[PDB]
Amino acid sequence: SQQTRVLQEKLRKLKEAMLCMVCCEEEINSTFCPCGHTVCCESCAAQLQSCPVCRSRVEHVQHVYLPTH
Amino acid sequence: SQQTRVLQEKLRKLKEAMLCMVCCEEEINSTFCPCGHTVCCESCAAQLQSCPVCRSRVEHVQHVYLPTH
Numbered sequence: 001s002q003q004t005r006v007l008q009e010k011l012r013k014l015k016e017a018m019l020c021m022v023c024c025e026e027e028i029n030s031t032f033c034p035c036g037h038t039v040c041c042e043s044c045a046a047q048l049q050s051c052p053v054c055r056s057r058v059e060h061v062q063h064v065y066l067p068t069h
Numbered sequence: 070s071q072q073t074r075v076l077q078e079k080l081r082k083l084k085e086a087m088l089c090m091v092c093c094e095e096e097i098n099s100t101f102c103p104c105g106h107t108v109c110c111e112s113c114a115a116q117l118q119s120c121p122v123c124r125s126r127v128e129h130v131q132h133v134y135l136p137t138h
Protein backbone atom coordinates (compact mmCIF):
# COMPACT_ATOMS: atom_id res chain seq x y z
CA SER A 1 0.00 0.00 0.00
CA GLN A 2 1.00 3.72 0.17
CA GLN A 3 1.83 3.12 3.89
CA THR A 4 4.35 0.38 2.84
CA ARG A 5 6.13 3.10 0.72
CA VAL A 6 6.07 5.61 3.65
CA LEU A 7 7.64 3.04 6.02
CA GLN A 8 10.23 1.93 3.39
CA GLU A 9 11.31 5.62 3.00
CA LYS A 10 11.53 6.13 6.79
CA LEU A 11 13.63 2.94 7.18
CA ARG A 12 15.91 4.05 4.27
CA LYS A 13 16.49 7.50 5.84
CA LEU A 14 17.30 6.05 9.28
CA LYS A 15 19.86 3.64 7.68
CA GLU A 16 21.37 6.55 5.62
CA ALA A 17 21.76 8.60 8.84
CA MET A 18 24.23 5.86 10.02
CA LEU A 19 26.51 6.26 6.90
CA CYS A 20 29.81 8.21 7.02
CA MET A 21 29.28 11.84 5.85
CA VAL A 22 32.56 11.88 3.88
CA CYS A 23 32.70 8.54 1.98
CA CYS A 24 28.90 7.81 2.03
CA GLU A 25 29.83 4.06 1.97
CA GLU A 26 30.78 2.77 5.46
CA GLU A 27 29.01 2.87 8.86
CA ILE A 28 29.80 5.64 11.34
CA ASN A 29 31.92 4.20 14.22
CA SER A 30 34.28 7.06 15.21
CA THR A 31 34.00 10.24 17.34
CA PHE A 32 36.09 13.39 16.86
CA CYS A 33 37.42 14.43 20.32
CA PRO A 34 36.88 16.76 22.08
CA CYS A 35 33.94 18.22 20.04
CA GLY A 36 32.04 14.89 20.07
CA HIS A 37 30.68 14.91 16.50
CA THR A 38 30.23 11.24 15.51
CA VAL A 39 29.74 11.41 11.73
CA CYS A 40 32.56 9.35 10.09
CA CYS A 41 33.88 5.82 9.58
CA GLU A 42 37.43 5.06 10.92
CA SER A 43 39.17 5.56 7.53
CA CYS A 44 37.74 9.08 6.84
CA ALA A 45 38.18 10.14 10.53
CA ALA A 46 41.91 9.20 10.38
CA GLN A 47 42.43 11.57 7.43
CA LEU A 48 40.76 14.75 8.84
CA GLN A 49 42.66 17.34 10.93
CA SER A 50 39.48 19.33 11.73
CA CYS A 51 35.87 18.29 12.31
CA PRO A 52 33.78 18.37 9.08
CA VAL A 53 30.71 19.59 11.08
CA CYS A 54 32.10 22.31 13.42
CA ARG A 55 35.73 22.87 12.20
CA SER A 56 37.15 22.26 15.72
CA ARG A 57 40.67 20.69 15.59
CA VAL A 58 40.66 16.89 16.08
CA GLU A 59 42.84 16.12 19.17
CA HIS A 60 42.14 12.36 18.71
CA VAL A 61 39.59 9.90 17.35
CA GLN A 62 37.64 7.59 19.78
CA HIS A 63 36.21 4.32 18.35
CA VAL A 64 32.54 3.79 19.35
CA TYR A 65 30.86 0.38 19.85
CA LEU A 66 27.17 1.10 19.19
CA PRO A 67 24.24 -1.37 19.56
CA THR A 68 23.10 -0.31 15.98
CA HIS A 69 26.36 -1.63 14.43
CA SER B 70 -0.35 -5.28 3.82
CA GLN B 71 1.79 -8.00 5.50
CA GLN B 72 4.88 -6.14 4.11
CA THR B 73 3.74 -2.97 5.97
CA ARG B 74 3.84 -5.03 9.23
CA VAL B 75 7.34 -6.39 8.43
CA LEU B 76 8.67 -2.85 7.84
CA GLN B 77 6.94 -1.49 11.02
CA GLU B 78 8.74 -4.23 13.04
CA LYS B 79 12.15 -3.43 11.45
CA LEU B 80 11.71 0.30 12.14
CA ARG B 81 10.72 -0.39 15.76
CA LYS B 82 13.80 -2.58 16.41
CA LEU B 83 16.19 0.00 14.90
CA LYS B 84 14.66 2.77 17.08
CA GLU B 85 14.88 0.53 20.20
CA ALA B 86 18.60 -0.09 19.51
CA MET B 87 19.10 3.72 20.10
CA LEU B 88 17.64 3.68 23.68
CA CYS B 89 19.81 3.72 26.89
CA MET B 90 20.42 0.08 28.10
CA VAL B 91 19.93 1.23 31.73
CA CYS B 92 16.78 3.48 31.80
CA CYS B 93 15.23 2.28 28.48
CA GLU B 94 13.76 5.82 28.06
CA GLU B 95 16.34 8.29 26.79
CA GLU B 96 18.47 8.19 23.65
CA ILE B 97 22.08 6.99 23.85
CA ASN B 98 24.39 10.05 23.64
CA SER B 99 27.44 9.11 25.82
CA THR B 100 30.60 6.97 25.38
CA PHE B 101 32.57 5.27 28.19
CA CYS B 102 36.31 6.04 27.58
CA PRO B 103 38.68 4.39 26.84
CA CYS B 104 36.69 1.18 26.01
CA GLY B 105 34.31 2.99 23.66
CA HIS B 106 31.01 1.26 24.55
CA THR B 107 28.25 3.76 23.65
CA VAL B 108 25.15 2.33 25.34
CA CYS B 109 23.84 4.95 27.84
CA CYS B 110 22.18 8.36 28.08
CA GLU B 111 24.20 11.12 29.95
CA SER B 112 22.33 10.64 33.29
CA CYS B 113 22.87 6.83 33.54
CA ALA B 114 26.53 7.05 32.29
CA ALA B 115 27.41 9.67 34.93
CA GLN B 116 27.25 7.32 37.87
CA LEU B 117 28.97 4.18 36.60
CA GLN B 118 32.59 3.38 37.70
CA SER B 119 32.97 0.46 35.27
CA CYS B 120 31.51 -0.21 31.82
CA PRO B 121 28.21 -2.17 32.10
CA VAL B 122 29.17 -4.16 28.91
CA CYS B 123 32.90 -5.06 29.35
CA ARG B 124 33.67 -4.11 33.03
CA SER B 125 36.61 -1.88 32.02
CA ARG B 126 37.20 1.12 34.39
CA VAL B 127 35.54 4.32 33.05
CA GLU B 128 38.30 7.00 32.98
CA HIS B 129 35.77 9.58 31.63
CA VAL B 130 32.56 9.91 29.57
CA GLN B 131 32.63 11.61 26.12
CA HIS B 132 29.37 13.23 24.87
CA VAL B 133 28.43 12.14 21.33
CA TYR B 134 26.47 14.14 18.72
CA LEU B 135 24.99 11.58 16.32
CA PRO B 136 23.09 12.30 13.04
CA THR B 137 20.28 9.96 14.35
CA HIS B 138 19.62 12.24 17.39
Ligand SMILES: CNCc1cnn(-c2ccccc2)c1
Pocket residue numbers: 016017018019020021022023024025136
Ligand atom coordinates in the same frame (compact mmCIF):
# COMPACT_ATOMS: atom_id res chain seq x y z
C1 LIG C 1 24.83 11.03 8.12
N1 LIG C 1 24.80 10.25 6.88
C2 LIG C 1 24.93 11.06 5.66
C3 LIG C 1 25.02 10.23 4.42
C4 LIG C 1 26.16 9.70 3.85
N2 LIG C 1 25.86 8.96 2.79
N3 LIG C 1 24.51 9.06 2.64
C5 LIG C 1 23.84 8.40 1.57
C6 LIG C 1 24.49 7.42 0.85
C7 LIG C 1 23.83 6.78 -0.19
C8 LIG C 1 22.54 7.13 -0.51
C9 LIG C 1 21.91 8.15 0.18
C10 LIG C 1 22.54 8.76 1.25
C11 LIG C 1 23.97 9.81 3.62
Ligand SMILES: CNCc1cnn(-c2ccccc2)c1
Pocket residue numbers: 067085086087088089090091092093094
Ligand atom coordinates in the same frame (compact mmCIF):
# COMPACT_ATOMS: atom_id res chain seq x y z
C1 LIG D 1 20.24 -0.77 23.09
N1 LIG D 1 18.87 -0.45 23.49
C2 LIG D 1 18.31 -1.39 24.46
C3 LIG D 1 16.93 -0.98 24.88
C4 LIG D 1 16.61 -0.16 25.94
N2 LIG D 1 15.29 0.00 26.02
N3 LIG D 1 14.74 -0.75 25.02
C5 LIG D 1 13.32 -0.79 24.82
C6 LIG D 1 12.53 0.17 25.42
C7 LIG D 1 11.16 0.14 25.21
C8 LIG D 1 10.58 -0.83 24.42
C9 LIG D 1 11.38 -1.80 23.85
C10 LIG D 1 12.76 -1.79 24.04
C11 LIG D 1 15.71 -1.37 24.31
Ligand SMILES: [Zn+2]
Pocket residue numbers: 020021022023024025026040041042043044045
Ligand atom coordinates in the same frame (compact mmCIF):
# COMPACT_ATOMS: atom_id res chain seq x y z
ZN1 LIG E 1 34.10 7.23 5.49
Ligand SMILES: [Zn+2]
Pocket residue numbers: 032035036037051052053054055056
Ligand atom coordinates in the same frame (compact mmCIF):
# COMPACT_ATOMS: atom_id res chain seq x y z
ZN1 LIG F 1 32.81 18.81 15.66
Ligand SMILES: [Zn+2]
Pocket residue numbers: 089090091092093094095109110111112113114
Ligand atom coordinates in the same frame (compact mmCIF):
# COMPACT_ATOMS: atom_id res chain seq x y z
ZN1 LIG G 1 19.57 6.23 30.75
Ligand SMILES: [Zn+2]
Pocket residue numbers: 101104105106120121122123124125
Ligand atom coordinates in the same frame (compact mmCIF):
# COMPACT_ATOMS: atom_id res chain seq x y z
ZN1 LIG H 1 33.13 -1.19 27.68
